């Protein structure tokens, strides 16, 4: 891995992970945002919060992290600790417990063209106003609003992640299905600002129907 070592040393010489990578002054950074739902942990009605386990899927380009593979033993990609590189400060704005960030920063996959893909895990408690009128024969509309906390739309431009569908990805085989909730719809949308400090959002919606057998029996 001595070629990898030399490449890493060259990559991070003069690199500042706090500076947003804009090729020129005034350029935006496109950040594609997607979501994978590993588990719908619960929907607490008393606290009015949806607990989920997810993997984010963030993609962007950092021009500073590009190299010619021919000059570095054909190395086409690298796996780098996420703290080493600039990250878009994408957080769950509508969290209910004060926790904005991901569960583990893991590592980012960087291609030789500077493309960065980051898929951190996250356990999120999001605020969800409960439509209590038809409980327990009810359906809920719980949203996960993701956005940069600091950068405005002129600095970081958000897009929905699709290679591709505008939806929360659920793997059929490995998904931990909830015994009290059935997922009816799971779309994702890009919300533009209404129209200098304005910010986009990527909202992942979960429309879920309760399965009321317990209350019928009891």
């Amino acid at each position, epitope marked *: 891995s001595e070629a990898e070592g030399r*490449l890493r040393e*060259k*990559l991070f010489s003069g690199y500042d992970s706090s500076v947003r990578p*804009a*090729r*020129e002054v*005034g*350029d*935006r*950074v*496109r950040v594609s945002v997607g979501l994978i739902l590993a588990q719908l942990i619960s929907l607490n009605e008393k606290d009015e919060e949806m607990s989920t386990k997810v993997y984010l899927d963030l*993609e962007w*380009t950092d*021009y*500073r*992290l*590009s*190299w*010619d593979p*021919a*000059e*570095h033993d054909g190395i086409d990609s690298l796996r780098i600790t996420a703290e080493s590189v600039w990250l878009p400060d994408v957080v769950l704005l509508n969290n209910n417990d004060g926790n904005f960030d991901v569960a583990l920063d893991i590592s980012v996959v960087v*291609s*030789s*063209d*500077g*493309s960065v893909r980051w898929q951190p895990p996250g356990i999120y408690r999001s605020s969800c106003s409960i439509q209590v009128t038809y409980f327990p024969f009810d359906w809920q509309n719980c949203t996960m609003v993701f956005s940069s906390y600091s950068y405005d739309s002129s600095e970081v431009s958000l897009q929905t992640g699709l290679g591709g569908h505008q939806e929360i990805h659920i793997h059929e085989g490995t998904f931990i299905e909830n015994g009290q909730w059935e997922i009816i719809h799971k779309p994702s949308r890009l919300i533009q600002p209404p129209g200098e400090g304005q910010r986009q959002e990527v909202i992942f919606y979960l429309i879920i129907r309760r399965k009321p057998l317990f209350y019928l029996v009891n």
Partner: antibody
Amino acid sequence: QVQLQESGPRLVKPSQTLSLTCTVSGGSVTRGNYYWTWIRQPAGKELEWIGHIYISGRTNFNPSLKSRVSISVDTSKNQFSLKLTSVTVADTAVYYCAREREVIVDRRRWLDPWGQGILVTVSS
Amino acid sequence: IVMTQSPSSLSASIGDRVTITCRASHNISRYLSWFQQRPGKAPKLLIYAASSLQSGVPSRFSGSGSGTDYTLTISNLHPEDFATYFCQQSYSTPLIFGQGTKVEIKR
């Protein structure tokens, strides 16, 4: 891996708008440190760099053709297009769409891959 | 930037060596590429960064130079190596191609 395909009318009349579209397969037009480039070669003469567009949407153009040239990117179709307004007979040429790769560590910039080329003739 | 590619035309035979120079008006930090165009075909990249050989190119093609002076060398010519050779610079915009040196069979 990535393939570029030019398309557009093969014949345009003078003083009109020449429009071309390059479709990119095996690669996103908004991902990676790339410049999506338009070049032309009139038959039997030098190659001329028309312009390029960066993934962020910023464009750069040849000063000779700066007023008449526009370049755009459509992310949904993975395409980028060129428009040249008020074309004369001198704008007849083989037009190429290319991808300029740029790397910071090795400090290099080079065109790879090129398109096949589309011959556009200006004639009423 | 103005790129002066010398000579405008050359004649060589199968097995001989070819040398093509492409001087630059301004200093270039090896942001130079050598392309080969056959009649009726798109330009084909041979060398980039003034020394790197493109994948799938025969090793006989060689690029060298720095600053303002750059050279392409074709030792042990082949029947398929009779084409037009262009030098392109990428140090600053607009990108400037060379005039184009054509090498054909010497009879």
